[PDB]
């Protein structure tokens, strides 16, 4: 019985990267050719394991993490990367054993005048550890002066909205991302 990936892949709504979605699935089969040839994928890399032996593998559960980021932020979804996404939103460990799938979804996730739904984290005191999630909304203090919840100079709201206009360059257009973690 192959795994039920359409529930996370074909889901009509995706989550922001800062409140990224985690779905576990148990006791099933993951074939590489069966899902590579599933659709139009702009990013499909597998670390740790080998794609060809994906269904020669045994594991307890599979966590299918999923979120929406923008095109030139997909390269951050990798081990040992850095930047706003991989430091404040979704860190992958250095020993990651699994896969990263991405694809363009301007047509789904962009609205004329903007799709102000998908958010991302812009600041944080410290670097997320692998698979840590944070949806706190505290005023990020950037200087010595305390913020006190009141926004202003060196006192920023930690979250911003993507533009996600269908007019933007593919560079800064919505991308659907699913991360398959095997443990």
């Amino acid at each position: 019985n192959l795994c039920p990936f359409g529930e996370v892949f074909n889901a009509t709504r995706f989550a922001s990267v800062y409140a990224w979605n985690r779905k576990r699935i148990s006791n099933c089969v993951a074939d590489y050719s069966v899902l590579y040839n599933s659709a139009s994928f702009s990013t499909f890399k597998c670390y740790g394991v080998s794609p060809t032996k994906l269904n020669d593998l045994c594991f307890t559960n599979v966590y299918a993490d999923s979120f929406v980021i923008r095109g030139d932020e997909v390269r951050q979804i990798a081990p040992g990367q850095t930047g706003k996404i991989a430091d404040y939103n979704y860190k992958l460990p250095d020993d990651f054993t699994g896969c990263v799938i991405a694809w363009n979804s301007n047509n789904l996730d962009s609205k004329v005048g903007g799709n102000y739904n998908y958010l991302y984290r812009l600041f944080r005191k410290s670097n997320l550890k692998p698979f840590e999630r944070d949806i706190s909304t505290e005023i990020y203090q950037a200087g010595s002066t305390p913020c006190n919840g009141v926004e202003g100079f060196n006192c920023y709201f930690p979250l911003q909205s993507y533009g996600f206009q269908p007019t933007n360059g593919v560079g800064y257009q919505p991308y659907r991302v699913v991360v398959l973690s095997f443990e």
Partner: single-chain antibody
Amino acid sequence: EVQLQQSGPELVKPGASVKISCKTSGYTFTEYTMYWVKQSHGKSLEWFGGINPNNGDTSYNQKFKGKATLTVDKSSTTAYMDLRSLTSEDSAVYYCARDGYPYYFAMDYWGQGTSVTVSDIVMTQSQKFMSTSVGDRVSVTCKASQNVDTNVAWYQQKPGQSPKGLIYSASHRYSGVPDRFTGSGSGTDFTLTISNVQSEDLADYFCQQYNTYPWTFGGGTKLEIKA
């Protein structure tokens, strides 16, 4: 190897304008907020305003509202100030200074200064002059108008020289500051004790609050030595 290098002295005739610069190096430019501090008649320190190099965010002290514009150039890791319809007031010494957060609070690195010629909280420093001898203990007071709980710093101005941070966060010593400088205070009244006064401690000592903007200074306390 932190270095804040400002532009040279500017002599400009009244009503004109001039753009001084602060070329930084030795650290990652975009990671630390930058401030400008004005030192003029009365020989006292006036916070001028800040700029965040990462987003170009600004905050202006409203005394000088419209007197200057703060910009940065990430291409050359440089902070600029652009002055505006100068009077005789504007003749002063302007320092650029780096916010230390999160490692050291307040202004942990200053520049050499540029001599240009042509509900606020009030830090009050009782004595404008003290005299001890070497090896004596001396203390210096500041009274803040409001509550500023431990968000106070102490600076050292040796003659002809930029201020150097001594105490930050009311009681913590900056990197390289001798043990005979201890800070004490909380809430509104703060003291700076120099315990074993050395020859080289002759200087002006300024307090500063950084609880809210604008940042504000005491008037200073000349400290003079004899032996």
